[model samples]
Target: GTQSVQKGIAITYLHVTDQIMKNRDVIRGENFLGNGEYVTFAGILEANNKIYTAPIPMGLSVYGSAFEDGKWVKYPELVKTEDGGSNSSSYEKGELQWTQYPNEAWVAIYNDENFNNPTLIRTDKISYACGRMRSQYYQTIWAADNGDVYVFSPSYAKIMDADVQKTNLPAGVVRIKAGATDFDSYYCNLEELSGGKSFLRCWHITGDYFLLQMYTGEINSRGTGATRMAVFKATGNGDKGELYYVDGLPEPDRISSFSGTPFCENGVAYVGVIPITTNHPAIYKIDPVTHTATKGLTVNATGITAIGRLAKDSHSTYVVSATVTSANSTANYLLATSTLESGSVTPGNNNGFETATGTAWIFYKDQYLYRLQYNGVTTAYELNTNGGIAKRSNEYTITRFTTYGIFGENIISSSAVDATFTDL
Candidate 1:
């Protein structure tokens, strides 16, 4: 029952034809808390086959999980505060007082997936607005194709009291150039480019072109509502950009919480649409250049939450620069696949994939379904010969968890008890 694993480049997601599978039992650890009544993570990041989640409660301590010598090792606190301590109190008393409501935002960078050492940069210019309900669906931090990391905030991204009329938080984008911990002087005012429109999320399509999902109605304090779509091309200087309204797309309907954002291949994006008034649910292909959408792949349900491709590997692929040895060394890297295929695209009923009614997040990769259920339990489902999904025997349960990501052959997740509180 042993399978030989090969080596290749580390990727965020798998492509069709990559023959890597989750062969071990599902392992779980409760190291942090959820956001509901506990501190939680806004997103997940992976590097060098190590899993990392950080800027806790949207900003603060960093956590990571690594598989070493055939054992799972969890680094509960990877970065220490300026005072040489790893607690929230130490961070609050330090020089960085950036943990205020709506203003707590930081960026953690792992050069070459070095979990033991990471660069934590405080981004005071941008706010993640973790209190917003819609913040769960889209990411505010992204890495451009050119290796620069950009942080964004949309209009009305601040959480305020009913009595408080307005907020001072700015809505725009900032960047941290590659190999630098500090943010550059570049700033893009998203509101100004959109003609005073407030957007829900921004998707980086390709190059300088990005897509924005505009809110159709007034944004409440919690930031929830219907959405409209648009595409824009940001300039290199970050002072200005051209925005275009997307045409030929249906009205916005609520996307299932379990679904992921549109998946982009090449320059075109494939989005799952769940219309409000019609019974037709399908995946729509979007072309940013033409600024229009064309329907493709009909589904049999009310929502098509996610769409992805996987591979079947028959040979070995290794990272040429990575040296493999018998002992644990920097040269010893996790095995993965680099070969990818574009296989045919089709949409039908779930293709025998089962559905979860409860709050869950689904990630598809390597012909397997990784489901994070509402109760902080993660289960893997494999595709059987019958063309249906069957749950694997392994399961991981994190007591009160927030978010997770897949790293090569491991799953890295983070949690926290509560947000750090200070008088500032």
Candidate 2:
């Protein structure tokens, strides 16, 4: 059976918004970020990672707070344990155990536990997910698996060949708290675990192909005493990239949520650092780049703060909060690289997107970096049709620790399709 659509647009395409500005940026960073209630305060981005091994690979998300059970079943309630009952054999969200606190702690989440509380991350119909971390106000704010998640200063990316294999969890950097890493001399951490979850803002460099953001500890920023931008060298490439503070570039004046953010790449880092003003905080090329902070606000957008964005099509894409801060679907950002070309909407360093198409897709809420072909060559432009919600409630990081070491990258897959046998 083949599934294909004729050569025509979605027809009278409509971009749906939920709950007005409230739907755009779901929560405020301070509501959960500082109080330890929310994991991180970053927003979403656009990408098409098309990773292998992930359950909802096409559009991945964050399943936080440890699923109530390890049954792999997404439904919230556990089936009765009887002779013919379905128990201990379902799936839910991804969960790691801590000697059992939630009563349903160790039940193989993401098809391993209950599925009662699906916050419904907007159901964008694209293939994407949170970039593998938990325990933050926001699980995943922005991501770009195909490089481009650089901070301009590093001038590097994970340009690895397609054949390169990846492991479950690659090792290099540890999400250390402010008290953990001594190099951390900035921001008097308001909370405790902020510094331990830093992968939510990370990305892989395309050309050079090395793990940068997740802590390879390559470059040193003795200037600011903060590893604001970290770079991992390519495997056996003789090029060791670590975060080095560019005295000429702009330093990270503010570090929003620490541990719950994403990883950096290409000698730079796109952090969830906002200016603490009306524009709100967003993902910007920090440290080694230009030292200039870019806001994620474009025309026709407002109130957005927690953003989930990614770079695409020789530029960058942002899935930001809309209409108002701390919500979803404010406006989009399709930025040009090297030079500020098309897709500039706002003033100054605009991070707003344009009404166009390039290479990317939106599945659920995750912005995938790859393209989807309807007939094999026709690329679909990614836009938010339905309002989005975050995957996980609280923030935490997800690390496989299996493949990330061998492959030096995270290989995720699309959603697990059901091959059910239907009776006529």
Candidate 3:
């Protein structure tokens, strides 16, 4: 496969009760950049239409690492929606660019080198908006070569030119998330792109074949846990589409990314196999040409939630997090270049069962590699360098992680702490 940039969506964490914002909320897996030159972990706090506070309206950050001189270097970049120094959405209001448009949420970026604070660089009102801890929104936002920005959600999926501030819109039959457990898909025509954005000119799947898990039925506290993933192909136009349903098979179709082919080392894909049911989920690779599925690295479930790229295609290691619940709460990225394989979740990592809905990152920097695992609660630690975070009591519980990956290079995993007698 040729070396190309990674393309995908955006997600954020929304706090519930009196907990840390990122804890048990929404999250995206790790990603690789710089053709393995750097590994990055990203996360953000999303605005909830009803339950949200400020001082940090929405917190989004991207961390980067690369070896410099003779030392392993690491850096953390921050992006945030404003809020008053207090507990409400005061700091984020007016301080940043926010508009009250019914159900619209604000999205922006920040740079440490330029300004001490995160500013509103861009604002988008896509068709889908992600809720805290729930994969309900359909926002596909990415940065491409020469400032070509792409944004897509369940309702909008298209390619745009940020330099021109001009957007190429391709609306889908999905006007919204419609709070329904039904199956519907449509490819809208980008009369502007000549009906090409909807067509996958090139793609590669990572973990399995079936692309999504579309849960149907009355589940949502009242319905049986019965759920299914909707798989489909797009017609020339974005609107001309049909839906595929796996009547009996639930696991295969629930794959995060199509794992039938090979992407570059930096090239990464994802597919999330929900965080709640179908115990002990695993990631299986497939031979695209032959349509063969082989189990890749297998691990436990429970604490595991979403899976994401750790570094660039040239860099081959990846990372996943545990998005679990304290009770009925459960786990949960995909849709993008390098082919989408969002991730996998193990419904029961430990026998006792706690929520693993934290963000995980595989980091590579200054020629060294490390891992960062953050829980929805306020405990944060570098997995490789630090033992599990010093557990915190309830009240202030939320932790965000920024990690880098070392693929072809020589580096140790954060879990190496396991060998440390001092850790115990």
Candidate 4:
């Protein structure tokens, strides 16, 4: 008898209310190894229902792995062979000479939401490999509403050692039009906008506004130090963008730069701030328009690293009816009356439409109810028409336990292993 064994990691999703768990394994077969080396992903991007990750040391080669359809697919052809492969000996010799063997700057674009078919765009500059600085959470690479993609550069010297000559690099952001394969003429000199100061992180705060965390002093070798915050606006059309310093926040020396990415909603950005002098950590809401910070939600923790919204499912269900006139003929109708109230209540049929009357069976799915009739046809109807049920399409779902009514209006803040939830 022959047997097969597989090795990899498991990704688990837990439904807090239902107390259910779903686990998916990412197999690490031999094909994923590069020269017998297990490549590591620095960060991940979740879009179009698929997860995309780039190999660390991304090297000169533009290789990417995507988790789609419950499997992992590799894109070795992301870049041409001439442009592919790692030049750095760090992976083999375990050295720290990343500057000598810089990785190629590239971007992978999926035009469709399902993440089918991808286009790779390579750049002339070196790509920044530090995920902490350019992670998806920070949104260093963001897609604008106009379908254009903007990629921000590290914009800082690789080596701070006075003995080593610094590399001359373009310190700004670049843009790629929606359907184009190359970089557009647009570029924003972020360093110039910030009075020659270099920043470590950039976050898109809706529309053309962005939040930047600039270093107030010389950062250590690991890229951490005093911090100052500012808001940058990308004016587009090759113009130098505008930068505004954030007012009403703590001093640069009192705040830490290792905080989590600011969570932006509507037009406001909420950032976690932990002062060195005080243990009282709070979320500061920044107005991109005025560039002012005001304390919002206070968390009972030593520090706050991340702030995000926790999605909950709506418990309300709609009553849908279908009237079959004849064989292969059916008139679908939606009930005009609906409620979010819990417990049982008799729903009157007079408030809903007649649609000429036929055989109908009421079924529930998501927040909508379906009237299933003969010929196995189902018509969906809204549960609540007052924008409550309509907005569920845009709400984030943590799991498929919507039937348990496990989701809704909670702001989750995390620091290390502890997570605190606040009601909106």
lDDT of 3 at 254: 45
Off by over 4 Å in 3: 1-100, 103-140, 145-147, 155-279, 285-295, 306-424
- Alpha carbon lDDT of residue 342, candidate 4? 23
Candidates' C-alpha lDDT: 0.46, 0.24, 0.26, 0.43
* Candidate that scores best on lDDT: 1
What local lDDT does model 4 show for residue 73? 27
Give the count of colliding residue pairs in each prediction: 9, 146, 85, 4
Ranking by TM-score: 1, 4, 3, 2
- Candidate 2 wrong stretches, greater than 4 Å: 1-131, 134-170, 173-198, 209-228, 235-273, 277-413, 417-424
For residue 300, give model 1's deviation from the true position in Å: 2.0
lDDT of 3 by residue, 1-424 (tens): 3322221122223222222333121212112111112211222212111111011112111111211331212212111234445322223322211111212222233322111233322123332222111211212332222222222232111121121212233322222112212223322322222222122111213221222223332113111232333333333124353334433333533433222112222323223333234454444433332433344443354333334433332432344444333566554211111223334323333212232333333223311112233354322221122222122233332233221112222211111000111111
TM-score of each: 0.62, 0.30, 0.34, 0.53
Candidate no. 2 TM-score: 0.30
Highest TM-score: give the candidate number. 1
RMSD of each: 14.4, 18.0, 18.2, 17.7
Model 3 compared with the native: what TM-score? Answer: 0.34
